[PDB]
Amino acid sequence: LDPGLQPGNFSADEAGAQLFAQSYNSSAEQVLFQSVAASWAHDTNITAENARRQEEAALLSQEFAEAWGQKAKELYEPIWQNFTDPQLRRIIGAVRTLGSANLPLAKRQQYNALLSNMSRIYSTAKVCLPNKTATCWSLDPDLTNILASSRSYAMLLFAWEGWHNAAGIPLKPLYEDFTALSNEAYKQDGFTDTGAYWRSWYNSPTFEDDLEHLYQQLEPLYLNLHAFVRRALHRRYGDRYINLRGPIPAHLLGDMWAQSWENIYDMVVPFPDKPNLDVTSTMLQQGWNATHMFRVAEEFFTSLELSPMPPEFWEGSMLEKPADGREVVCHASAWDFYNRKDFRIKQCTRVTMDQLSTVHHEMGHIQYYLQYKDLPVSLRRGANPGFHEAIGDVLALSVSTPEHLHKIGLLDRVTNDTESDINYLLKMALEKIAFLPFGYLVDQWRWGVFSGRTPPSRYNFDWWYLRTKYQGICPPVTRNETHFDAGAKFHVPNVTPYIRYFVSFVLQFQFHEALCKEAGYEGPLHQCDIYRSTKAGAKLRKVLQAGSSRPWQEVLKDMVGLDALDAQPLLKYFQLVTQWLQEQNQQNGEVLGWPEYQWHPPLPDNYPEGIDLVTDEAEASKFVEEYDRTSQVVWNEYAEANWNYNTNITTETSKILLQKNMQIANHTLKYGTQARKFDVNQLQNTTIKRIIKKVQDLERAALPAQELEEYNKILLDMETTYSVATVCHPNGSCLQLEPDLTNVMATSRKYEDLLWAWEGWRDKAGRAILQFYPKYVELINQAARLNGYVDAGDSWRSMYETPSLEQDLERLFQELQPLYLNLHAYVRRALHRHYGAQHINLEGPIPAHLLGNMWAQTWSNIYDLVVPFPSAPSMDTTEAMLKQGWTPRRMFKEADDFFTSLGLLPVPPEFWNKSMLEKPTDGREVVCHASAWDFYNGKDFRIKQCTTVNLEDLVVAHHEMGHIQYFMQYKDLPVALREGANPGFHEAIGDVLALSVSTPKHLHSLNLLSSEGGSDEHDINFLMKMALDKIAFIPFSYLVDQWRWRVFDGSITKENYNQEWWSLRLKYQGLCPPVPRTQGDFDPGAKFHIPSSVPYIRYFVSFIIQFQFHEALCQAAGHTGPLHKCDIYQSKEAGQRLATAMKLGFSRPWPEAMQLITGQPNMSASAMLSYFKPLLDWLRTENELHGEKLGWPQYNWTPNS
Ligand SMILES: *[C@@H]1O[C@H](CO[C@@H]2O[C@@H](C)[C@@H](O)[C@@H](O)[C@@H]2O)[C@@H](O[C@@H]2O[C@H](CO)[C@@H](O[C@@H]3O[C@H](CO[C@H]4O[C@H](CO)[C@@H](O)[C@H](O)[C@@H]4O)[C@@H](O)[C@H](O[C@H]4O[C@H](CO)[C@@H](O)[C@H](O)[C@@H]4O)[C@@H]3O)[C@H](O)[C@H]2NC(C)=O)[C@H](O)[C@H]1NC(C)=O
Ligand SMILES: *[C@@H]1O[C@H](CO)[C@@H](O[C@@H]2O[C@H](CO)[C@@H](O[C@@H]3O[C@H](CO[C@H]4O[C@H](CO)[C@@H](O)[C@H](O)[C@@H]4O)[C@@H](O)[C@H](O[C@H]4O[C@H](CO)[C@@H](O)[C@H](O)[C@@H]4O)[C@@H]3O)[C@H](O)[C@H]2NC(C)=O)[C@H](O)[C@H]1NC(C)=O
Ligand SMILES: *[C@@H]1O[C@H](CO)[C@@H](O[C@@H]2O[C@H](CO)[C@@H](O[C@@H]3O[C@H](CO[C@H]4O[C@H](CO)[C@@H](O)[C@H](O)[C@@H]4O)[C@@H](O)[C@H](O)[C@@H]3O)[C@H](O)[C@H]2NC(C)=O)[C@H](O)[C@H]1NC(C)=O
Ligand SMILES: *[C@@H]1O[C@H](CO)[C@@H](O[C@@H]2O[C@H](CO)[C@@H](O[C@@H]3O[C@H](CO)[C@@H](O)[C@H](O)[C@@H]3O)[C@H](O)[C@H]2NC(C)=O)[C@H](O)[C@H]1NC(C)=O
Ligand SMILES: *[C@@H]1O[C@H](CO)[C@@H](O[C@@H]2O[C@H](CO)[C@@H](O[C@@H]3O[C@H](CO)[C@@H](O)[C@H](O)[C@@H]3O)[C@H](O)[C@H]2NC(C)=O)[C@H](O)[C@H]1NC(C)=O
Ligand SMILES: *[C@@H]1O[C@H](CO)[C@@H](O[C@@H]2O[C@H](CO)[C@@H](O[C@@H]3O[C@H](CO)[C@@H](O)[C@H](O)[C@@H]3O)[C@H](O)[C@H]2NC(C)=O)[C@H](O)[C@H]1NC(C)=O
Ligand SMILES: *[C@@H]1O[C@H](CO)[C@@H](O[C@@H]2O[C@H](CO)[C@@H](O[C@@H]3O[C@H](CO)[C@@H](O)[C@H](O)[C@@H]3O)[C@H](O)[C@H]2NC(C)=O)[C@H](O)[C@H]1NC(C)=O
Ligand SMILES: *[C@@H]1O[C@H](CO)[C@@H](O[C@@H]2O[C@H](CO)[C@@H](O)[C@H](O)[C@H]2NC(C)=O)[C@H](O)[C@H]1NC(C)=O
Ligand SMILES: *[C@@H]1O[C@H](CO)[C@@H](O[C@@H]2O[C@H](CO)[C@@H](O)[C@H](O)[C@H]2NC(C)=O)[C@H](O)[C@H]1NC(C)=O
Ligand SMILES: *[C@@H]1O[C@H](CO)[C@@H](O)[C@H](O)[C@H]1NC(C)=O
Ligand SMILES: *[C@@H]1O[C@H](CO)[C@@H](O)[C@H](O)[C@H]1NC(C)=O
Ligand SMILES: *[C@@H]1O[C@H](CO)[C@@H](O)[C@H](O)[C@H]1NC(C)=O
Ligand SMILES: *[C@@H]1O[C@H](CO)[C@@H](O)[C@H](O)[C@H]1NC(C)=O
Ligand SMILES: [Cl-]
Ligand SMILES: [Zn+2]
């Protein structure tokens, strides 16, 4: 056994300890030299061959430490603390620390290999997508780069969790075993636990207490910065993920561990316009090279009259990426061979301003070694383990200053711009101030572990609690005791303390302030440099010269003047950013800190399936531009043919239209598929947000081509079936739905013929639709689900943008029941005297085939049988219009006048030349359903009506003009939003401007009626005529879409379609079928919009909200008294009240426009009840005159045969 490796015999005396120590020093540096030599070789020449040597030399070192430690611990430990000279005690104490070696060999292997496994797992940790990806991501570059570079919350979250999953989960069991052995080993050394040993290095009886006091003094700076970043992150990600008062999601801070916020500087940079001064471009033109960069650095130290580099340095240092091309650990490091004769830097230098500063840092280490190289090896270390880095840093700060750069010559003028330095200082603030709490809590956490304050069942609980309490962060996902996120940070599984850095950071600024004060410098500390200040160099040298001989605190007191750490120097360095940030925080009213800490974000909508979705908003903006630009042409093209065909039925126009139909199909699918690639939930431009959400709906196109084909096939089969069904008399005479059968329903008073027509249409048209409905439902439900809805019912109901729709609709309907019930009963009485009790039960629901309409959706056809007062007309308005020479254009002209008096946009000139106001006489065939058309060209707007000169068409004209008016004033929005606030609004506006038309006042104002006796009966007569549609149509319109909703809900099946229909027909319309019906019939097929699969609830909304608007206009127009006597005419303000609302188009939720119009954000039936209040009174009264009893409790009655 080499005497140079094993201690000899020594007494327990100080002289013996001195002789032992002296002997230890001589051999120790020899051993260390061998160890580092191979270390340098492998690190400088990466190969398994050198790895083997490194492994061997390190092994030898341990045996040496074991031999000497063994003797030292045995010899002096009973007396060592009494040795007079602390110098000796320091040396002996270090060697006397055996650590792991204390463990028995079996535990040694377990402990040593265990540590190796912990290290292996961390570096081996791989994160893989939930796909059989060809290659996964490792911690770096992939995971760190993607996490540092990506800004997609979903993507960023997945990477953050995966790393914690792979790294944390497997470490949790192992780390416990380390805890037992680690504490067990140090127990033999004499420390209560691993934590006590690490804290022992700082020789501070109140060390941990000191740090909390330090941290509390820095918290004011940290909170201000935390609030500022919190605000900035909120600007980027939105309140959904950033609670202005709560903690910040750990994964959004730009780095896997949130230990450094540098990567978010691009979002927060003050004065973004001032460029960061980079001297690299000049450095290159200066011909500088890495080798000279270091000699430049050496000159700085010579300016400090410190020791220049030994020639050994120029020879040994691995300044560059070696020309030999052999592999090397390019990460810049400074190496000190304990051989007093040499020290080396390994830079792998590349010419950048950053590396220039880096080199100065590393050289500072070299300078530090040189100054204490004279001390014994045991003392040739920092005053405290954090002390080392600080010295290197303070040197790094001074040179980074542009003042210093100018002194070097790399800058022509030192522009003293506060915006520049604030931008710079803020970058440094994000780089390291954000680090302070993190570095503190990790070792705060570990002491809890080693002390047992955090038992195993709390590894993760205390981790997040501590991480949240100090750093102000919460997890991106709820995490529980199964996890061990502590294993996610390199320093944990590698069991390397973190506290050194935090203390080092405070010492850095603490030293810096001292030298600046020593250098006679004044003013801004961040503008200080120590260059050329020999007096300060001597002070710095003093601190280095002592090395680890003198206790760090003693040296610090001599340097700066204070026996302990303090935050004051650090704050003064950042004073400027401190002041500035508070104002930025003050102006935003930020809540310093994070109350309501128990808050955290929701998971992404499709996590983890949506983690690769594109969230960049700049391209989405351009996307919307191209979409509008292209969609305008396609819809206009579509509209052109669609208009051309609707007026010119010529068969070839249909062929043309079909081809155009394919184009919109092409376009819809093309841009729809592209739209689905944008992730809307992360966007913040509200306009773009709604636009993309809409376009993302692919409707039928979400179905597979085969099923889409099958779906369209079925639609046409149903559409065709309805299109060709007819009812035929026994003689074979066949009647069509319109106008033929409609006239029967409208004109017949014969119970037999009405039933035959109603029954017949339902028998041939109705029953047949069951040939397709079931699969039809299944298919559209499949499509709805593929579009992200629960079912087709959810899909349609979603267009009202309000989840409580059905509840609101329900309440709205209930509020009309008193009126509807009175009307219902009154009509029943009218039917009673014409069809008799044998067919009319005055105490039950009404036979659904007598309401004058094939579907009983509108009762206006029976007005003659229900009129409350005859002698209603003072003049025939039809003959009067004829007498006054009224023409279709004159009719629409009067409407434009009304609209002009209301200050709304006049109709464009081309309208008068391309609209079709009359039945063509050139043999063209027209689709006569009156409607209004928008060509999306900001100039083409047209009306198509088979205009007849009568009052009815006069209402149609205004109604159509209403739509036109609505198109014109939102023409400025992009096509994607050229829609009403909601489906109802568009159809609702149509009535509002028309309502006044039929009032007696407006009727008379145009002399359509000569003066009439001012009877209320004429008002009542008009109001009932209105109610006979406005009211009756409400419940029917409600029932259809509810019936479909519950069918889309799957809650209703074919076995009872008929029963659910009639049950609803009873509950909502108070109706029953005229004759019993069994399965095989499917009455709902009897109404077009069902087999045509078109929603109806819009009409209901239209007939409600239109009355709120009318009241608002009458209120704004100043009208008082009976609401039906209101006349909007020429109200310059009332028009403007609507104008501002219409311009919103579909860009806003309808509650905004609703309020902007009426002053309320909710739909309210009260306006309508008020409108009909007089008629209700009369009808209610009439019920008393006849003693009519309201309701239909006696469900089962039908007309007698
Ligand atoms: C890294 O940089 C080193 C520093 O180079 C200096 O700084 C850079 C930014 C340039 O400005 C460069 O021109 C500077 O020299 C660099 O070392 C330098 O390498 C250059 C060539 O690349 C050498 O140039 C020659 O210099 C001599 C004069 O220098 C000697 O004498 C003076 C005293 O007079 C001493 O102070 C010096 O230390 C040297 O001992 C010139 O006489 C010689 O002239 C030749 O070229 C001219 C035409 O230009 C002809 O007319 C002559 O007849 C000769 O043919 C060169 O100009 C320079 O000596 C050297 N300086 C030092 C201090 O070593 C180093 O090579 C770089 N390393 C890498 C890896 O890039
Ligand atoms: C920890 O252990 C190491 C190794 O034992 C000690 O390192 C020795 O340190 C001493 C100085 O403390 C060094 O002595 C120097 O020797 C130089 C001559 O070296 C040649 O000659 C010797 C034999 O005399 C050979 O062994 C050697 O290989 C060379 O061939 C001198 O030139 C030096 O001069 C300096 O010191 C003298 C006073 O001694 C002054 O008068 C001079 O002006 C000058 O300042 C010096 O004498 C010795 O070389 C080191 N050994 C090794 C192997 O490097 C550490 O000292 C010890 N730690 C402590 C705290 O003692
Ligand atoms: C309803 O829509 C229909 C389809 O758009 C219109 O039908 C067109 O009616 C015109 C007459 O009104 C017919 O004119 C004939 O066209 C053929 C072929 O013309 C083509 O070739 C010549 C060169 O030889 C070219 O100059 C033309 O532009 C055409 O490209 C001639 O041979 C005849 O002499 C006559 O001019 C069209 O044929 C006919 N087209 C179609 C597709 O049916 C109809 O006019 C519309 N009705 C209204 C009232 O607008
Ligand atoms: C330090 O001093 C101790 C004594 O205080 C030395 O220990 C002795 O080491 C020798 C061998 O180097 C041992 O010799 C053997 O002794 C036994 C009887 O004890 C004898 O039968 C054998 O034939 C052999 O000679 C001796 O046992 C051992 N003594 C004790 C008490 O362990 C040690 O060598 C000294 N080391 C140095 C570096 O000075
Ligand atoms: C980097 O590391 C590798 C491996 O540690 C070194 O490779 C070894 O280099 C030596 C010479 O430097 C080789 O030995 C010599 O090879 C020549 C040519 O065959 C022969 O003429 C000599 O007599 C002697 O055998 C050795 O084979 C080679 N490989 C190994 C495994 O040792 C490499 O030199 C290192 N480079 C640096 C810059 O440190
Ligand atoms: C560090 O991790 C390695 C790898 O997990 C551990 O090595 C493994 O150690 C176990 C026993 O400690 C060996 O178990 C044997 O496995 C074979 C199947 O491979 C089985 O047939 C035997 O009955 C037995 O269970 C295992 O072979 C061995 N693997 C290797 C590659 O050597 C090591 O023990 C871990 N050390 C610590 C301290 O956690
Ligand atoms: C702690 O919380 C974690 C989640 O944060 C819990 O682990 C999770 O447990 C569920 C099932 O309980 C796992 O999901 C299931 O996976 C199976 C396939 O293994 C699948 O068939 C199921 O449909 C379901 O998706 C989930 O993957 C798992 N996640 C993790 C990260 O382990 C754990 O149970 C909680 N433990 C305690 C004590 O609170
Ligand atoms: C949201 O994005 C839309 C779409 O680009 C922006 O609309 C632009 O508005 C300016 C005037 O404000 C017009 O000059 C542009 O023509 C509009 N864009 C297009 C494509 O026409 C809108 O300003 C954005 N709003 C917010 C709050 O981000
Ligand atoms: C088939 O028979 C019915 C029943 O006789 C005919 O319907 C009548 O048509 C006339 C006008 O053509 C009406 O005035 C009657 O009121 C209808 N009666 C009924 C009960 O509806 C029908 O016209 C006959 N068709 C043919 C082609 O002979
Ligand atoms: C010296 O030893 C005595 C007796 O064990 C003890 O009371 C005293 O505290 C020791 N001195 C030091 C500095 O530990
Ligand atoms: C920059 O200007 C400020 C003005 O308040 C001054 O305090 C500071 O000393 C100036 N710095 C330099 C380097 O001129
Ligand atoms: C449009 O649809 C037709 C259908 O056959 C197809 O042939 C054509 O390639 C499509 N074009 C685009 C751009 O989608
Ligand atoms: C309408 O057409 C006539 C020709 O029939 C033309 O004189 C007039 O200028 C056209 N007006 C507009 C607005 O196009
Ligand atoms: Cl709808
Ligand atoms: Zn360093």
Author numbering: 1 to 1201
Provide the publication's sentences verbatim.
The zinc metalloprotease angiotensin I‐converting enzyme (ACE;EC 3.4.15.1) is well‐known for its crucial role in blood pressure regulation and fluid homeostasis via the renin–angiotensin–aldosterone system (RAAS), where it catalyzes the hydrolysis of angiotensin I (Ang I) to the vasopressor angiotensin II (Ang II; Ehlers & Riordan, 1989). The somatic isoform of ACE (sACE) is a 1,277‐amino acid type‐I integral membrane protein with a short C‐terminal cytoplasmic tail. Each sACE molecule is composed of two homologous domains (N‐ and C‐domains) separated by a short linker region and each domain harbors a catalytic site with a HEMGH zinc‐binding motif (Wei, 1991). sACE is related to the carboxypeptidase ACE2 which, in addition to its role in the RAAS (Turner & Nalivaeva, 2022), acts as the functional receptor for the severe acute respiratory syndrome (SARS) coronavirus (Li et al, 2003) and SARS coronavirus 2 (SARS‐CoV‐2; Hoffmann et al, 2020).
In contrast to these studies, the overall cryo‐EM structure of monomeric human sACES1211 shows an extended hourglass‐shaped conformation with minimal occlusion of surface area by the presence of a second domain. The domains are distinct but closely associated and are separated by only ~5 Å. The 29‐amino acid interdomain linker (G589‐E617) loop does not spatially separate the domains as it was expected to but is instead wrapped around the N‐domain. Each domain divides into two subdomains flanking an active site cleft that spans the entire length of the domain (~50 Å). Interestingly, the cryo‐EM structure shows both domains in a fully open conformation for the first time, reminiscent of the open conformation of ACE2 (Towler et al, 2004). Although the domains are closely associated, full‐length soluble sACES1211 does not have a continuous active site channel for substrate cleavage. The N‐domain active site cleft is instead inclined by ~45° relative to the C‐domain. This incline could prevent simultaneous binding of large substrates to both domains by sterically blocking access of a long peptide to the central C‐domain cleft through the C‐domain lid region, upon exit of the peptide C‐terminus from the N‐domain prime subsite. Zinc was modeled for the N‐ but not the C‐domain.
